[PDB]
Ligand binder design. Structure first.
Ligand SMILES: *[C@@H]1O[C@H](CO)[C@@H](O[C@@H]2O[C@H](CO)[C@@H](O)[C@H](O)[C@H]2NC(C)=O)[C@H](O)[C@H]1NC(C)=O
Ligand SMILES: *[C@@H]1O[C@H](CO)[C@@H](O[C@@H]2O[C@H](CO)[C@@H](O)[C@H](O)[C@H]2NC(C)=O)[C@H](O)[C@H]1NC(C)=O
Ligand SMILES: *[C@@H]1O[C@H](CO)[C@@H](O[C@@H]2O[C@H](CO)[C@@H](O)[C@H](O)[C@H]2NC(C)=O)[C@H](O)[C@H]1NC(C)=O
Ligand SMILES: *[C@@H]1O[C@H](CO)[C@@H](O)[C@H](O)[C@H]1NC(C)=O
Ligand SMILES: *[C@@H]1O[C@H](CO)[C@@H](O)[C@H](O)[C@H]1NC(C)=O
Lengths: 318, 170, 169, 319, 171, 318
């Protein structure tokens, strides 16, 4: 006549790690590291912009790939892999900081500069390297100022943008660096060229430099871009001889949003708060091993493939 | 480690399924149940561990290194060193968290197993003896309603005391 | 978890005011209450031990200006890093307090059980357990004798013969 | 006859979190995270310097806001929010690295360069933008060199600072960028301006640039400043012909100190080792939630209002 | 903690140098000592298990971000110093926590294997013995040298001596 | 008749720290923080390169000290304290970035630019500041171009380097800044000097500047060095007037290596994975207190002298 105490066991047990014991069999366990991610960008509940082959720099500057992305509002800005910033060859000083600022934004508005040029200036300069529909074009938000009459000296010219708003504007301009001494003379003349730019908080000077260079998109010349934030109530003045690629509109970065760099397809059904190159990560678990480079509200990345957390007792089979 | 699971109890009961902890029978008529209160106390503590785990006050992070272009070399090298340093910490954190956590879950299962045992030891009082393997050899009759008295925590020992004392002592 | 606190002991004693652990007794001479010194100092010492580790104390200088422009890319790097550090400390602190709280609670438990086990083994065969943290004593135990139990000076053999008979009929 | 064993309990217990339960009643508990700071700068024990409205860079070039802060020793240097660095508008190259050096220092000495100029040069250029006694002045450690004869060509000039000390010196100079072609001609002449600066470990050339700009402190011109460290026994030489804003004194940053940015008022009666913008933190606790950006010997910041450390057993009152 | 090692066992045996846990006995034919392989090995497997965890670490490769031999730009150097110290505080704190937390569990685990042996013997002797409370069992029958070994063997049949012991106990 | 139970103790116990107790005696314990390191660079099983007094930059431009390290392959590269980069005094733009790229490389190859110069130009300029077989020499991968006749205007010159490889190359040139008008006139003439450098992805102008200066290596002029990466299939063109220190060879960084800055002598019969200025670290321990600046696969640096880990029970002596 007896009474006996005991506990349960299971046929198939799960092996966990402890302080004293790797390989400890247990009646149950749950994974703590998320290893499965969604191949798509889960955009549900997010007002987002997909830039496609438009580079963020190209939104300020008006690259033709960016025509449908010159203004807008967003939660989430998405950048794709080989996006076009420039049509006419060149580069931008401090571009990665500039790129970050745009990917931290929540939208862009554009504001006309109301710049105006005398009769000796042709401001509808265009180029074979910026195609819109069939034809030669240029950056939509800038203007290639050249002498109306080939070979004549570009007039000494002054244009001043006044920020009359209650928020900082971002202004970009270009400096044209011609391929040949001949190209320079044709557009600007034989005078020494000089461009100075000055606000209350910025001053700089540029001199166009003629040099032999390889052709990029069929062009040996370059245009280098420069930028700066203009504070409210401040004025910025452009002084120039020819070589200034002048802004026709400036930008206002608005609010805050989440910048994603990915090649994943959008999906508006699926919801998420964590993103990486290859997609989305939706999980309860506090750890993931999909990617060390994520953005958003993400679980912490750990090197381990698996960390099983026991949810039962020791497994003791008969 | 308390003494029971993987201890003086030789093995678990694959056949038992309606709890983590139960009893097994024997008397005239007799041959298994489950304790509700003891397996709940255990389970309750697993789901508390689970809630802390899926607790997510996640900080919002943005990108500091570009996927699609060259970052400046020196600052990229600092970003790499830092990100790697941070990941070593979380890998260490994570591994320690579950090894420590696992140790405590196992040992606590053991505690609840034992605590039931001792609750019964103390109920049975003098009317029974421990066999050293998890059972209580009993020295009176009961009865399958009496056994229900043991499980239900209602058993009166002094009701059967005399009867069972003389069965132990002669 | 050890069985005693929030376990086979059903509740605590607010009447006990200078001891963490103690005794109640009932005999011919009436009742009484005594706190046990050693078992509660044993618990309190381990508490002030955690407190001392807690308050054990690197100099840091400023890396982000408060009153001026900091370059954009480097400032992103500093915020990223500083937030990452904060997540680690925030996780460390939540873990420390949670794990230490569990251990504190169970050590307290442990100290209650060890007192109870000390007494039980000290009463040897002269007593039995009711399963609520009481010992039914099968002889007469006047106040001076109850005290001897709280002293660890109780000699079980003194009362054994009388006790065993009282336990058998 | 019986004896019973038991533990205390209290009527009003406090809740803590454990690994298994986030609502656990215990007999006592204590905070592990500081929530209250001292909104003052506790400077007791500390030989400190409150810069008021003097910006650190201004100590080096001698901005008038910094006239009482041109030399000194200190173990704590306090910077206030709208501190003035420039009277005459401009900027400094690597301003932040420079501000941090100064803010890490334990003092500043000034050593004279002994620079001396020919009679075709006027050294005493002043400007409406630096005022002293309510009249035109200029940066105290620098000199605005111009043609003594308005419109004439600034003589080709050379000046060499020699460090005969046993420790590095910090040298600052400015380059003047006029706002008009006429201003430029008036001050230095019609020749091409050029300023070169070379030591054993430093080399740079500089060209004044004319450009139209908004007025800042009533001025459209700009002085841009540059700086470099000059090692002991090394010499640094300035070759110039107009535009150089020349050092008349050089600085030596001395020792080490703690740098605080804050507008909290100084309290000279309490002491402290931890600071942030909104004052001081003084605590034995290892975590604080006052501020993620602190300075000195601080507890670690955590994003949590409260974290309670059980300092007693499970509280279990009667039914 | 379990009440045993720094508890009801008064002290340790400096003479026991084969085991972690053991028996001493005294019957009529002499006094002897012996160590218990099972329970000591239980505790040692748990020690080497910790040590394994401690050294069973695989590492990430790090490159230099700080020039030993040349001057680094002031601001980036300050960032690097802040980060580096901040990582070190985290590791120093982590190591301290690791060791304090793991030493606690080790001391108490040793104690549990001490108790688990005491309980086994106690349940084994059954009604044939009583405990004083210093870790000893007063046995109420003649325990042979081969009987003693039987208790250590886990061989011991309590029923074989029960009646002699029950008789001896009750008077 | 008694059977008793007990544990062991020792005379000499060890003190460890717990969660509740700082001074806790145990039967036994071991260290968790390594304090002893090897005073050698343990290079066994590594294809290593000890640069000696050659600075990594000097590898690219070819300083005499670097004559044994102009090309090679390695998985580990060791920079030393007495390292020379410049014989003729000068500086490099972005020197730390460049040094880091060299120290992460797995080798260097060299490729001729194939540049050739008309009779007006003397390629063979040497200086007392670079010495080579007792004789005046110059950087081995560059050429100091001057006017063959002492006062004549250096001719307007163009040279293009074409990268016909599959990988990117790294090209270095220098700009000479004379210490005097006489030094300048003699080398290049009285004309107005200028150097442009352009490629698809790089563009820049340089002007030699005369300034007086202290002597370094007995030399008062300086040569500032510039570098850029030339992509596969791309070309870089040098337009210059005098002042250019021209590349005669370019570099190709290959693969990946671990860069090391150290005091310690090499030990090629010793294996390691963890290094610092003072040597090597070989340990099973998770923590270390020798150096906060380590490189490789290392235990983590802690601010403690010791952290003893209990490997025994409470020691309770008789
Ligand atoms: C680099 O230089 C080469 C040679 O001048 C250029 O390639 C030549 O390419 C053109 C058209 O692509 C051909 O018509 C020639 O036959 C090629 N020459 C040889 C010998 O290959 C190349 O375009 C230049 N790179 C860039 C980007 O400008
Ligand atoms: C920016 O330009 C505007 C106009 O050129 C300046 O503001 C004028 O401000 C003055 C001073 O109050 C008034 O007398 C004028 O009536 C204003 N004109 C207009 C049309 O607004 C302003 O000062 C300049 N800002 C800066 C920072 O230089
Ligand atoms: C720093 O300047 C001093 C003085 O110009 C240089 O040292 C001197 O050498 C010259 C010529 O040998 C003597 O006429 C001076 O009298 C010396 N001065 C002293 C104080 O002895 C020194 O060479 C310069 N330092 C460097 C590094 O160029
Ligand atoms: C509460 O805990 C604190 C810290 O341990 C202690 O100072 C105080 O005496 C305790 N008193 C109670 C029970 O409030
Ligand atoms: C002391 O501890 C070390 C590390 O665990 C171990 O190698 C050694 O065996 C211990 N000493 C004894 C006497 O066991």
């Amino acid at each position: 006549d007896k009474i006996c105490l005991g506990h349960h066991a299971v046929a198939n047990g799960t092996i966990v790690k402890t302080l004293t014991n790797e390989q400890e069999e247990v009646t149950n366990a749950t994974e703590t590291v998320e290893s499965t991610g969604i191949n798509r960008l889960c955009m549900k509940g997010r007002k987002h912009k997909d830039l496609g082959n438009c580079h963020p720099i190209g939104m300020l500057i008006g690259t033709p790939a960016c025509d449908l992305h010159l203004t807008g509002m967003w939660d989430t800005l998405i950048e794709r892999e080989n996006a076009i910033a420039y049509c006419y060859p060149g580069a931008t000083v401090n571009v990665e900081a500039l790129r970050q600022k745009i990917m931290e934004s929540g939208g862009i508005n554009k504001i006309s500069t109301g710049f105006t040029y005398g009769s000796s200036i042709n401001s509808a300069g265009t180029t074979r390297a910026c195609m819109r529909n069939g034809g030669n074009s240029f950056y939509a938000e800038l203007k290639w100022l050249v002498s109306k009459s080939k070979g004549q000296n570009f007039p000494q010219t002054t244009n001043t943008y006044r920020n009359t708003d209650t928020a900082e504007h971002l202004i970009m301009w270009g400096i044209h660096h011609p391929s040949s001494t001949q190209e320079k003379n044709d557009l600007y003349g034989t005078q020494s060229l000089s461009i100075s730019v000055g606000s209350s908080t910025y001053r700089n000077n540029f001199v166009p430099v003629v040099g032999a260079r390889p052709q990029v998109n069929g062009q040996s010349g370059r245009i280098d871009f420069h930028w700066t934030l203009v504070q409210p109530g401040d004025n910025i003045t452009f002084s120039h001889n020819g070589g200034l690629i002048a802004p026709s509109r400036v930008s206002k970065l608005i609010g805050r949003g989440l910048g994603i760099q990915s090649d994943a397809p959008i999906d508006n059904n699926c919801e998420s708060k964590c993103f990486w190159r290859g997609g989305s990560i939706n999980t309860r678990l506090p750890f993931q091993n999909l990617s060390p480079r994520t953005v958003g509200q993400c679980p912490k990345y750990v090197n381990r493939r698996s960390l099983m957390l026991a949810t039962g007792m020791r497994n003791v089979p008969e | 480690l308390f003494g029971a699971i993987a201890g003086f109890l030789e093995n678990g009961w694959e056949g038992m399924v309606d709890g983590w902890y139960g009893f097994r029978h024997q008397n005239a008529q007799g041959t298994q149940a489950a304790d509700y209160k003891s397996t709940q106390a255990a389970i309750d503590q697993i789901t508390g561990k689970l809630n802390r785990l899926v607790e997510k006050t996640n900080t919002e992070f943005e990108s500091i290194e570009s996927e699609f272009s060259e970052i400046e070399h020196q600052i990229g090298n600092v970003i790499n060193w830092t990100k790697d340093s941070i990941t070593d910490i979380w890998t260490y954190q994570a591994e320690l968290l579950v090894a420590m956590e696992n140790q405590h879950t196992i040992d606590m299962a053991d505690s609840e197993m034992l605590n039931l045992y001792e609750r019964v030891r103390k109920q049975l009082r003098q009317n029974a003896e421990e066999d050293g393997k998890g059972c209580f050899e009993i020295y009176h009759a009961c009865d399958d309603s009496c056994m229900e008295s043991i499980r239900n925590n209602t058993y009166d020992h002094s009701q059967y005391r005399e009867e069972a004392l003389l069965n132990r002592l002669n």
